[PDB]
């Protein structure tokens, strides 16, 4: 869980300590990451979704989820994938809420995002390149 | 400098925001955040429609379903309660049970009608720019449409006014919303018919969009004699608000109004080259089906199947249906005399065509309403009764 | 012909359709109102704000999109829902839900006006009003809905439509802007709902309150309420047209002055003490003395611009105005005594005035410190706020002869031994029933029309019952099932439970047994 | 003394047992007419079930109404009172009754008693509502003639109250 | 200055207010020739306040007083107040009918109406006055 | 406790708000509050549409109208500028002059289409509930509408993709908005045709809403041979972005597109009892008139009457019109062969009725376009050329 | 037929139309890009966010009203 924090790793260092890690020889190339980042802009519907979906069943299924308060938006980072079922959110909100309505406040994604039925999903998988590990 | 103090905003004034932050507890004082959580959900989850509507009416426990107690604080001279059981013959274990399947509280209702309002004006500006009125049959336009579709506005207007006592008398919040939205849609129908007439007058020199000829036809032409008599009875002859809603929407408008609007003017528009009227009948027919959804829930789901008063209620509904179906058959029998004025089109305005139209209207009605309250009806008998008024 | 036509782009504007509305009616013998009325004069008037259904929907939807954008996007992102002073957040449980029933009853009253109107244009205008009062019902519901989601105390915001039934203040609300509108003369609704209700009292109740909301950190209520009132100008204009019809006919104008005075007293009797109490005691930061608010909106502006101007045409200044003005100055302080003393019957958390509040009350109402202030400070000494004290002030009132009475007509509580507002107790027996009346205007109403005024009061329903049992039965608890929704303080600690109430041993008396 | 709970108590339970034993339209009509005369309006005979009579009356109405639909022909539901009287004759009789009233005190008792006797389900709803409306019009107009003309002291005498207390 | 929110007796406080408030001549209403207009603050309304009401409006009616009441604008004047939506539309640069103007016209003390593109609240008693 | 700082809001935090209040000047530093006040307004006062749109494109002074200076920072391989005068033959003194008369920036555009989007689905849910499909002529429904209206979507779709290079190449902001909004309306039309077919499929057992038959007809049926040839040329044969917009909307779509959509499918729907299609063509025709207002302003007000290049531009517009009108006349000549497959209706599908339809299309086009650029055209000659393809 | 039909309320959802978008293209010799590119590889990919013009407008209009409400009102 901690490794997905906004200020994880080198972001804890300050002053010369940060500079030495930032300019270290091993950190002059990118490093593959299994994570995804999801940004949701704060609103009535989104704040409900954060509290009762992402911070409960979502973190239950994916305990590596980190949710940070960035004033105007929510910053979420997790290993592997993050999913939000617009059907679950509509049940919680008590009003019409398709997957198209959920995207109204889905602000940004770092990873491979897509909608499938009522579910929005952002995943580390490289669809079209990664080969399916099961025939199911 | 103004005479009154410029009030500092507690949200943004640093001194007042600091005072407020010191007073606000650092934790919530209850975790139940669902507004009126105790409402019994009709669907799998409680809807915002229900939260905003349900139990707004302050009924006491002696009006079935109410959560309050005691007598009203002020009653009519004589003793008539603010709301009371004397307002209708029908009975139920809970007047709050009704739910509009479209879940219309005020905002989604005006939101949807705003779309139709603005798109309508964009369509008319383009339709006039298109010149598409050039291909409409002139006799249909001048002698059938302008006069008898215009006269039909008075049927929609009378059905609209039938809801005035319903808006006052009815016994729950969701019923009141269902009733008032239905009334606006009816007066909308009347205003949209007059809008189409005013619009054609801008395109056709000599086309008179005055309501004089339509009104004379509604009040004196035998074609609308049965229809006007029915509307006058539904609107001003009764005050039982369930009788008004049922007779208005589930019988009269479901048979006569559906035939006039959909089978005659909408269908024959697409036989006489009328590219304008279908845009307007599309709205009245959309409103009808939305109104039917809610009317059907009130009378079928709630009242005709109420666990204690279902059969009791079906007795009154069957008596009303008998009366107002006879009124509507008579109205339709008068109305079909108008086919003697239209150009013959095989399968449309000949006896076979009219017969199949009445078979749809009465057949659909039997499925949608008659079968659901236990009212036996011979469709072919009602079709043949109307065809007695058709000039071969 | 088939080739040549004017292809200029044209539509049809709302006033082009509205011009033909009056012709939509037709004459038949039965075409008359179904409701009893004294007014049968000519009423073929013209609408001052021409609307049709499509244009009605467009206007209101445009208002809504902005309102809900502000609520669900902007104010939510700011966390504005929990930036309200607790006193004010608690006050909006009462103001919004109580006003909601006024709006809801206004739907029915406007339908009576719709039914009694004879001209098609007025029937069209009153339908728009009926629609607006539905809109306002859902707007008031939406405020408490929003508070339930974002404010630190959702209890009471989230269930007032049943928990209001526990307490005495709700009874009077069911008359002031409810039963008083819909249970009587239909055409008279143009006088009591509109000429008085909408043209006089909605302005302080719905507009002025938004400045108190702002002062105390609430930007939710101004967003909604200020949109609510935009609809009111059609409503006033609707009522004014009918009042001109009544005044122009001598037969109907002979009823107008009496109906105006009863309407004004009926509404001010409750509105004046309750709203003044909610403003001054249900706030931290105060905008102005309530009596100055009353003077500005009720006495000077409505009294002058509507009733004073109509004095040219035989409409008299209400005879009850002097008594009303006395209520504007003291009645809400009287009411505060009842409200604080019987706090467990409400659904809001209350705060005794602090030292800054007390100095403000005394500077603006000289004499307040020695009468009301000393009582509030004694209750605090006795443990008013402390759940372990076993102290509820209603018992203290009774133990010192300060009985609380309920007006049979208006339902407003009255404490004759402590009140400085208008009132004197009258107790009559009639056909074996005792009745307590509290002023000359309501006593006349009850003497003339006893069958209109049979409202059970809290003492008659609760007689001999212990306080915690009434509260529990009425669901006056939070989700744990034990902690009271209502509280005698606004802090987050030391909340009272049913057991804390039980220790006080408060049992409801029969206040009229002594007569 | 000590009231029972509001919505479920021994007084309502006991009365629901009496109501369940009604078996005919004639029997439940006399039951509901006697009840409304005994327990409703300012001229009721007894306030002994004051906080319960409105709920109890609702339950009598429900019994009479189901008995009407079970036992009566449809034409009777529309055109007759459950007393057997012609509904339109009831309307004409009571309207003329109140129009002949010589004072607001006669007119008020006529209107109140009409409701005690003919409140639905006794009279058909449509006939009842227009009759009650016609009566209220008469009662309102006579009560609002010189509304402030009689001093409170005089009104107290005309009403016949026992004045138990007047604050100084 | 007589149209200010705190004009007249509203300047008094404490006992001085009570003595005026309970004075004998002030137990009956007094005919006023004024109108009160309330406009809820919005982007559109605020531009109208600054560039219409407080300029051409006050030049035409110097008795106009505009007061800041946090969430709304409070306006009082002698006789009448008028706002032309066609003028406001040219000011805002977007379509703006008289129906659109009323979206943020919150309250009225006086006889209000629309006639064409203009909105008016007036002291005149239409249907009673000549 | 999250790893990163929970940032205090300067609007609500007492300390930061007090710091900001101290730094904000007690007076405005300028009185000019009109965003881009220097734009020359087309109408009485500057519109918000102009404020938000005009001069967004950063053109230099060597592209007529540009306020900037110098060469682009980076160009194509070879030297093609980011935007350049080589992109079109037409010339002007100011490429920014264009104004859409509907004043559509992005928000009013999607606002309007959202209204149509939501209302369409309410209309369909109600139309299916009405069962109104029951009175449509089956032969029209199955053999003409499904197949040839289906095939027409490819014309709309091709016209949509013609805008792709226009969206890249055109030389000003208001023009780019006009082009892109016109492109979405075209692909909307194609998608709406498929929506109606998919809708009928849910209502009529056996009705096949697959695009296989429409696509085969579009690509191989002689009825669409000339139409497909023109669309392919306009879309992929040229890159002059003014030629694309002119040939697309002002010649081909204004002649062939208007005949197919309005004179054939919309008009005849109201002859063969089709109460569904007029709802869909009501949208395409509205879109056409909106696009025309913008296209009319660009080529007539701005280009054909540019103070310095008016006659210069009319030389190219006349050469293009000569070419693409001939292409459209051939398309129309192929298309009217479709009347050989429809049931004859006097005054609509006979030779007389098709002639009057062609007179409306060519007559309206002469007034709306040809007359405004000085293009000489004999209407009767163009009508007779197309009628040569009509099987009498 | 003329009397019998399924009157169940139905519409057409955006993914039902989107399913047929790929078939809207037809083959002809000049159906190629106008712009210089080094990349000439096969690119018959599928969209991840199915949208049609009507649904595009609904989504963005909904975003706009919330944004412009916040700005112009609150
Ligand atoms: Cl002065
Ligand atoms: Fe209201
Ligand atoms: Fe109102």
mmCIF file with all atom_site columns, C-alpha atoms in Angstrom, chain C residues 340-344 384 389-397 467 496 500-502 504-506:
data_model
loop_
_atom_site.group_PDB
_atom_site.id
_atom_site.type_symbol
_atom_site.label_atom_id
_atom_site.label_alt_id
_atom_site.label_comp_id
_atom_site.label_asym_id
_atom_site.label_entity_id
_atom_site.label_seq_id
_atom_site.pdbx_PDB_ins_code
_atom_site.Cartn_x
_atom_site.Cartn_y
_atom_site.Cartn_z
_atom_site.occupancy
_atom_site.B_iso_or_equiv
_atom_site.pdbx_formal_charge
_atom_site.auth_seq_id
_atom_site.auth_comp_id
_atom_site.auth_asym_id
_atom_site.auth_atom_id
_atom_site.pdbx_PDB_model_num
ATOM 1  C CA . UNK C 1 340 ? -35.569 25.974 25.094 1.00 0.00 ? 340 UNK C CA 1
ATOM 2  C CA . UNK C 1 341 ? -37.714 24.572 27.928 1.00 0.00 ? 341 UNK C CA 1
ATOM 3  C CA . UNK C 1 342 ? -39.225 21.801 25.779 1.00 0.00 ? 342 UNK C CA 1
ATOM 4  C CA . UNK C 1 343 ? -36.147 21.088 23.611 1.00 0.00 ? 343 UNK C CA 1
ATOM 5  C CA . UNK C 1 344 ? -36.434 17.239 23.803 1.00 0.00 ? 344 UNK C CA 1
ATOM 6  C CA . UNK C 1 384 ? -29.413 22.651 31.064 1.00 0.00 ? 384 UNK C CA 1
ATOM 7  C CA . UNK C 1 389 ? -28.118 16.744 35.423 1.00 0.00 ? 389 UNK C CA 1
ATOM 8  C CA . UNK C 1 390 ? -31.613 15.282 35.201 1.00 0.00 ? 390 UNK C CA 1
ATOM 9  C CA . UNK C 1 391 ? -32.762 18.840 34.468 1.00 0.00 ? 391 UNK C CA 1
ATOM 10 C CA . UNK C 1 392 ? -35.319 19.747 31.798 1.00 0.00 ? 392 UNK C CA 1
ATOM 11 C CA . UNK C 1 393 ? -36.701 23.289 32.140 1.00 0.00 ? 393 UNK C CA 1
ATOM 12 C CA . UNK C 1 394 ? -40.359 22.488 31.402 1.00 0.00 ? 394 UNK C CA 1
ATOM 13 C CA . UNK C 1 395 ? -40.627 20.856 34.856 1.00 0.00 ? 395 UNK C CA 1
ATOM 14 C CA . UNK C 1 396 ? -38.951 23.953 36.322 1.00 0.00 ? 396 UNK C CA 1
ATOM 15 C CA . UNK C 1 397 ? -41.590 26.162 34.686 1.00 0.00 ? 397 UNK C CA 1
ATOM 16 C CA . UNK C 1 467 ? -41.260 12.292 28.003 1.00 0.00 ? 467 UNK C CA 1
ATOM 17 C CA . UNK C 1 496 ? -28.334 13.183 25.641 1.00 0.00 ? 496 UNK C CA 1
ATOM 18 C CA . UNK C 1 500 ? -30.911 10.848 30.287 1.00 0.00 ? 500 UNK C CA 1
ATOM 19 C CA . UNK C 1 501 ? -34.393 12.209 29.571 1.00 0.00 ? 501 UNK C CA 1
ATOM 20 C CA . UNK C 1 502 ? -35.944 9.414  31.649 1.00 0.00 ? 502 UNK C CA 1
ATOM 21 C CA . UNK C 1 504 ? -35.746 13.779 34.769 1.00 0.00 ? 504 UNK C CA 1
ATOM 22 C CA . UNK C 1 505 ? -39.112 12.054 35.232 1.00 0.00 ? 505 UNK C CA 1
ATOM 23 C CA . UNK C 1 506 ? -41.015 14.556 33.095 1.00 0.00 ? 506 UNK C CA 1
#
